[PDB]
Structures are given as structure tokens and as C-alpha cells.
């Protein structure tokens, strides 16, 4: 709908199939499956970037740095 | 033990009953229920304080402010 697909579909689909190879299990992916993955990944990244920008503001900095990403993920409870 | 006593038990239970007067007018609490409540409140506050000190460190400030508390809660997903 309103969401625009920023990430190019082909390289993302390459990445999804690489992740299948690392797991060492051979399965096929529907096109609808790959697009739902792409929408979720982009949304998660945007949401993480929002929290990251919040951290950068708190530091009185206009530029975001890996410090900001790590702090936001740490509070979120990720690994 | 002196280290383990973070929240005084009696003022906490007065506060639990004061909240209890807003959902069911006549209520009774079990001793184990309140003790679990105090344990949970202490752990949540400590977890929030840790995130807060992480936010204060990010701001180059030794002292923590309500700025830091609100940011940690916002990222944790508590209050928008």
C-alpha cells in the first residue's frame, strides 16, 4: 500500500537464499514469502533507525553512529 | 540482610492496597502475592535504571535526569 520497497528485490532475494544455504536445509521460497521478508526487514530497520536517531539527539549530535545503534538494540533487548 | 532490602515492605504494601481500591472495592491479598509483587517491582525498576544509566552515559552526564528515564521507556515500548 503506502510502503515503498526501497531495497532492490533481486539482491535481497539473493540474501534470503544465502541464509537458506547457511542453515544447510534445502527449501523453496515463494515470491510472496520473499516480499513479506523484505517488507518486515525494511520496517524493522526504519523502526530501529528511529530509535537510533532518538539516541543521537540525546547525545546532542546530528549524525548517527554505531554507538547509537548499539544502545538502541541493547535497550530493545536484542543480541 | 541489609543489602537485599531494596524497598521497605510496609510502604509498598500500603501503595498496593491504595491501588487495590480502584479495581475491586473490597479486596484481600495473599502474603505470597504481595511478596511476589515487591520482587517484580524491584527487578523492573532496576532493569529500567540500568537502561537509564546507559542513556545518561550516552549523554556525557554522570547524573541521570528524567530525560534519560523517558528515553529508555520509549525505546522499551512502554509509553509512546
Amino acid at each position: 500500500k503506502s510502503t515503498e520497497l526501497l531495497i532492490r528485490k533481486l539482491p535481497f532475494q539473493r540474501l534470503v537464499r544465502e541464509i537458506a544455504q547457511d542453515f544447510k536445509t534445502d527449501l523453496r521460497f515463494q515470491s510472496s514469502a520473499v516480499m513479506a521478508l523484505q517488507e518486515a526487514c525494511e520496517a524493522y530497520l526504519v523502526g530501529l533507525f528511529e530509535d537510533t536517531n532518538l539516541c543521537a539527539i540525546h547525545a546532542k549530535r546530528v549524525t548517527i553512529m554505531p554507538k547509537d545503534i548499539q544502545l538502541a538494540r541493547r535497550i530493545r533487548g536484542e543480541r | 540482610k541489609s543489602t537485599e532490602l531494596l524497598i521497605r515492605k510496609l510502604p509498598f504494601q500500603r501503595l498496593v492496597r491504595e491501588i487495590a481500591q480502584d479495581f475491586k472495592t473490597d479486596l484481600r491479598f495473599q502474603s505470597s502475592a504481595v511478596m511476589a509483587l515487591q520482587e517484580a517491582c524491584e527487578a523492573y525498576l532496576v532493569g529500567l535504571f540500568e537502561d537509564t544509566n546507559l542513556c545518561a552515559i550516552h549523554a556525557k552526564r554522570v547524573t541521570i535526569m528524567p530525560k534519560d528515564i523517558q528515553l529508555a521507556r520509549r525505546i522499551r515500548g512502554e509509553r509512546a
Binding site: - | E4, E39, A40, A43
Partner: protein, 182 residues
């Protein structure tokens, strides 16, 4: 529900000469109820997703794979498949618990599975699989908590020994997610 006597049996099997305190026993019981609720909840959602009306050993196995981390998942799946095949190969044992070679009560597990209204019907192999998974996790925890008690020169497992066993194991800490206990 109370699983304490079965945890005591498991404790005597991995560490024959190690006891446990009342608070530490209550911790083990709450862990078993917590994971039972999580695995049972995951098996019911899988049963409604595939439009089945029955939970079999397959639904319990996929639930355990989803909830436990890698090695714990591999070890729990192995124990579950072994208990099902023992129960599926031989009819000779008088009790359903000894039929699968388990200390945990398969009958209590099957009764609680049906009580929770997770599905229309509960298969025969699901409670055996769930009991085996619960037994292995209790064994791994009690083995590590017993190892901590031996290192402290303590003859019984107290709460802090349980905490050390959990958070020092990556997968055990991830599985409990630092649940709070005092």
C-alpha cells in the same frame, strides 16, 4: 501442578548424593510449569495453523524446535523421539511412564494437555514427547546446578546454584530469558 517428586527422581539420577532446598525446589517447579505452558501453547497454535483438530508428537516436536535454542533443541528432539519409539515399539510395561523409559509422569502430562483446552483431541505420542523434553531440560539444569553445588562444596542445590547453572549456559540463559526469582 506439582512435579517435585519427579524432579527429585531426576536429581537422584544425575547426582545421586545431592539434595535441594525448599526454595530451590520451588524454583524448579515454576520452571517446569513455565516451559510446559510455553510448549503447550506453541503446539496449540501449530494445530490451528495446519487446521488439524488433534495434537500429536509432531506438533510437540516443532514447538520444542521453535522455543529452545540450537543444542537444547537438538538434544530435546532426540530425547522426545527416543521416548516415542520406546512407547511405540513395546506394550509390555505396566505404567505409561516406564513404557517410554521416563521418570516424568506421562499420564499427568496428558491430563494437563487435555485440561488446558489446547485442541479438540490429544494424541497418544504428544504427552510422551512433552514428558521426555521436560525430563531432559530438568536433567541438564540439575546436572549444571549440581556441578555448581559441588564446586561450592555444598551438599544441596540452593537458589543461587540454580542461577549460576542457568545464566552461565548461553542456551539456558536465553531459554529462561533471565526470569526473576528470589
Amino acid at each position: 501442578e506439582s512435579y517435585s517428586i519427579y524432579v527429585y527422581k531426576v536429581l537422584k539420577q544425575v547426582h545421586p548424593d545431592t539434595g535441594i532446598s525448599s526454595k530451590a525446589m520451588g524454583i524448579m517447579n515454576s520452571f517446569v510449569n513455565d516451559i510446559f505452558e510455553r510448549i503447550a501453547g506453541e503446539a496449540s497454535r501449530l494445530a490451528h495453523y495446519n487446521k488439524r483438530s488433534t495434537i500429536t508428537s509432531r506438533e510437540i516436536q516443532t514447538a520444542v524446535r521453535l522455543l529452545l535454542p540450537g543444542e537444547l533443541a537438538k538434544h530435546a528432539v532426540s530425547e522426545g523421539t527416543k521416548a516415542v519409539t520406546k512407547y511405540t515399539s513395546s506394550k509390555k510395561a505396566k505404567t505409561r511412564s516406564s513404557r517410554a523409559g521416563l521418570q516424568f509422569p506421562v499420564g499427568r502430562v496428558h491430563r494437563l494437555l487435555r485440561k488446558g483446552n489446547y485442541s479438540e483431541r490429544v494424541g497418544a505420542g504428544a504427552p510422551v514427547y512433552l514428558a521426555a523434553v521436560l525430563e531432559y531440560l530438568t536433567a541438564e539444569i540439575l546436572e549444571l546446578a549440581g556441578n555448581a553445588a559441588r564446586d561450592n562444596k555444598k551438599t544441596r542445590i540452593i537458589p543461587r546454584h540454580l542461577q549460576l547453572a542457568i545464566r552461565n549456559d548461553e542456551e539456558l540463559n536465553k531459554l529462561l530469558g533471565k526470569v526473576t526469582i528470589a
